[PDB]
Design a protein around this ligand. Sequence first.
Ligand SMILES: CC(C)Sc1nc2ncnc(N)c2[nH]1
Ligand SMILES: CC(C)Sc1nc2ncnc(N)c2[nH]1
Lengths: 190, 193
Amino acid sequence: RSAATREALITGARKLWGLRGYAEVGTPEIATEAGVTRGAMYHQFADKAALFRDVVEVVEQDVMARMATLVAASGAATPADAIRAAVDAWLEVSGDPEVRQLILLDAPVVLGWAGFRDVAQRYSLGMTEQLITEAIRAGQLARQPVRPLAQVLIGALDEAAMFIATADDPKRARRETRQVLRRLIDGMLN
Amino acid sequence: EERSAATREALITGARKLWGLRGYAEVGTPEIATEAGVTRGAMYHQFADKAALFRDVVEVVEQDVMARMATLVAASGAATPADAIRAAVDAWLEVSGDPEVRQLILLDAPVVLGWAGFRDVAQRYSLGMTEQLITEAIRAGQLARQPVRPLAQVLIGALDEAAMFIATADDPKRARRETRQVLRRLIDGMLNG
Ligand SMILES: CC(C)Sc1nc2ncnc(N)c2[nH]1
Ligand SMILES: CC(C)Sc1nc2ncnc(N)c2[nH]1
């Protein structure tokens, strides 16, 4: 009922904002894409930013699912190779035009830095801490505090993706950034 | 004329002090005018609104952050580019740990300036110094030849997240010790020297 309306609105908002950006699409156009009235939409979402918060949750769930599948697919043989594949998986997924627009460009603006940090960490800290713990257990990464390392790596990878997202030559930005991240990772791994 | 130049400096000083202590959201422009000893009319002549005064406060705070980083690196006695990078990382944790810098740069500025605004300021102050330390290390053979701007950007993201993690940690003393250790391991893995 309400759940059907909310799911229609989130789907339509993800599609249209994914293509043209948060700033360029109003709630009435999203209501039309979804097949609901303005009244029904206003009942479910106070304002545009509330609908965007639910869009970011569903997109982040999909980002983390896709990254897990690419890492499972990579044929990584050790925890060190799992971390290298996880970095390749992030650059691949964050290079999706919808992810670029909603997560890398719009979410930091609409959510704020604190908001974006909270979402990024809520979705990514667990996977990141896991990869670090497995590398430490396999003797391929120095025993060190896991959470601070995970935090710093997430900040590095988020900034890498945002640099590529806004680069004048994104093809070259991506190749050069991937080399930077490999050197950084490889200096930690043994 | 001289009265107005004095008023502008008094407002920036008083706003920096009070917002530094209690946060942007907790201090209004009337209290800042009173602190500075000027009328609301004199404050309104200098600053269209509260956020315009905050933008000028961020500029003098950022100038002092970058000056203090340069001072702490000069004071380290670093003799090589590699040792200057190690000193610069320790200097950022020290400077970003100043309670006024924490409150105005790490907490208030992203909110008041917005994302685009805050990133533009952060880059204007930090990218130059960072790229210079990287170029010197590459020239000295202490860092592999590579494109400078992508490395600078990734390291700035790492260092910004380190500072924000300490700023909001349950135990900031421990967060800072542990973050300093992981950043030292990270740069020592990349530096030939
Ligand atoms: C996969 C991780 C090693 S890196 C990462 N950064 C992120 N930022 C925003 N949303 C996410 N899901 C992120 N994941
Ligand atoms: C230059 C390096 C220590 S990293 C750095 N990130 C920053 N963010 C905001 N304002 C600054 N001055 C910053 N410096």
